[PDB]
Amino acid sequence: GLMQFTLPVRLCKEIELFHFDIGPFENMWPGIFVYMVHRSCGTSCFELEKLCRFIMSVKKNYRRVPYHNWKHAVTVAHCMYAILQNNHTLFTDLERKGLLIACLCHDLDHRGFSNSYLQKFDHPLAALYSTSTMEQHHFSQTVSILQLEGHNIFSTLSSSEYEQVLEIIRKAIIATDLALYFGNRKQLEEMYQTGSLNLNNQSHRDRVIGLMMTACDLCSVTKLWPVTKLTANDIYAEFWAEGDEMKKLGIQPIPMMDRDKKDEVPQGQLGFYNAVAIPCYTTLTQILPPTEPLLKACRDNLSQWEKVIRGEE
Ligand SMILES: CNC(=O)c1c(NC(=O)c2nc([C@H]3CCOC3)cnc2Nc2cncnc2)cnn1C
Ligand SMILES: [Mg+2]
Ligand SMILES: [Zn+2]
Numbered sequence: 001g002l003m004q005f006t007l008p009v010r011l012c013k014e015i016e017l018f019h020f021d022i023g024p025f026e027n028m029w030p031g032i033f034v035y036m037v038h039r040s041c042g043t044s045c046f047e048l049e050k051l052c053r054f055i056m057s058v059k060k061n062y063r064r065v066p067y068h069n070w071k072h073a074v075t076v077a078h079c080m081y082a083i084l085q086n087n088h089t090l091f092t093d094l095e096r097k098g099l100l101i102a103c104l105c106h107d108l109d110h111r112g113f114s115n116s117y118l119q120k121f122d123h124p125l126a127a128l129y130s131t132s133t134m135e136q137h138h139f140s141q142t143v144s145i146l147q148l149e150g151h152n153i154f155s156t157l158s159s160s161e162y163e164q165v166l167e168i169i170r171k172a173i174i175a176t177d178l179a180l181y182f183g184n185r186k187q188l189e190e191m192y193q194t195g196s197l198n199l200n201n202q203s204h205r206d207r208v209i210g211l212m213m214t215a216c217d218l219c220s221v222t223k224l225w226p227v228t229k230l231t232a233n234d235i236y237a238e239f240w241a242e243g244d245e246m247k248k249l250g251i252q253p254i255p256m257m258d259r260d261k262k263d264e265v266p267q268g269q270l271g272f273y274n275a276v277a278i279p280c281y282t283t284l285t286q287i288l289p290p291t292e293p294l295l296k297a298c299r300d301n302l303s304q305w306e307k308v309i310r311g312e313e
Pocket of ligand 2: 106107134176177
C-alpha cells in the first residue's frame with residue numbers, strides 16, 4: 001500500500017529524460033517499469049502481487065534474440081513513460097494504464113524475423129494472420145498472459161473499462177507494424193495542416209496513439225550516439241540472420257538483410273532516418289510539442305551517420 005519503488009539518484013533523474021538508457025543490469029528492469037507505472041498511473045493502478053507476476057511472465061515469453069528482446073520491451077515502455085509524463089493532461093487514466101502495458105507486450109515471442117520472412121517461409125502464423133502477422137501474434141500472447149491465474153492486472157476495472165483498455169492495447173500493438181506507419185503518418189500530416197486534427201474524435205486519438213507507438217518503438221534512434229550505434233549492430237545482427245535464412249529458401253534478400261553488403265549500412269541508415277524516423281518524430285512533435293527532444297536526438301544521430309560516410313568516423 002505505502003510501498004514505493006525508489007531508484008538511485010542518477011536513475012531517479014535520468015529516467016525522466018527521453019534519452020535515458022535502462023542499463024545492462026537485467027534484474028533492475030522490472031523495478032524500473034514498476035517505478036514508471038507508479039509515477040505515470042499511481043500506486044493504486046495495479047495490485048503489485050499481480051503486476052509483478054504479469055511482468056515476470058511477460059519477460060519469460062521474450063526470446064534471447066539480439067534486438068527484439070526483453071530490453072527492447074522495457075526501452076519502448078520507458079519512451080511511452082517519457083511521452084506521457086511530458087503530456088500530463090492529454091491522456092485518460094485508462095490510456096496511461098493501457099499504453100505502458102502495450103509497450104511492454106508489443107513484441108512478445110518475437111523470433112527476430114520480419115512478417116515477409118514468415119510469409120516466404122510459409123510459417124503457420126502467416127496462415128492464421130495474413131497481415132500484421134507478428135503483431136496479431138504479440139497481441140494474442142498478451143491476452144494469453146493476462147488470463148493466467150493471478151495475472152489479470154485489470155481485474156478491478158468495470159466490465160466496459162476492461163473492454164476499452166484491451167481495445168487500446170490491441171490497436172497500440174497492431175500500430176507497431178511499420179507497414180501501417182507510412183499511411184497513418186500521412187493521414188495525421190494532412191489532418192494537422194488542414195486543421196481537422198481533433199483529439200476528442202476517437203478515430204483521431206487512435207491515429208495519434210498509433211504514431212506514439214511507432215515513435216516509442218523506434219526510440220533506439222533517439223539515444224546518445226554511443227547507445228544508438230551499438231543498438232544498430234544488434235538490429236543488423238537480426239537482419240543478417242534473416243538474410244541468411246532467405247538465402248536458404250533460395251531468395252536474394254533485400255540489401256538491409258545481406259551481411260555481404262555491410263559497407264552499405266551507413267547509407268542504409270541515412271535512408272531509414274530520412275524515410276522513417278525523422279518524419280515520425282517531426283509529425284509527433286507537431287501534434288505533441290513537448291516530445292521535441294526525440295526529434296532533436298534523431299537529427300543528431302542522422303548527423304553522426306553523415307559523419308561516418310564522410311570518413312570522419
Ligand atoms: C523500412 N526500412 C527499414 O526498415 C530499414 C532499416 N531499418 C532499421 O535500421 C531499423 N528498423 C527497425 C524496425 C523496422 C524494421 O525492423 C524493426 C527498428 N530500428 C531500426 N534501426 C535502428 C538503428 N539504430 C538503433 N536502433 C535501431 C535499415 N535500412 N532500411 C531500409
Ligand atoms: Mg514488432
Ligand atoms: Zn518493437
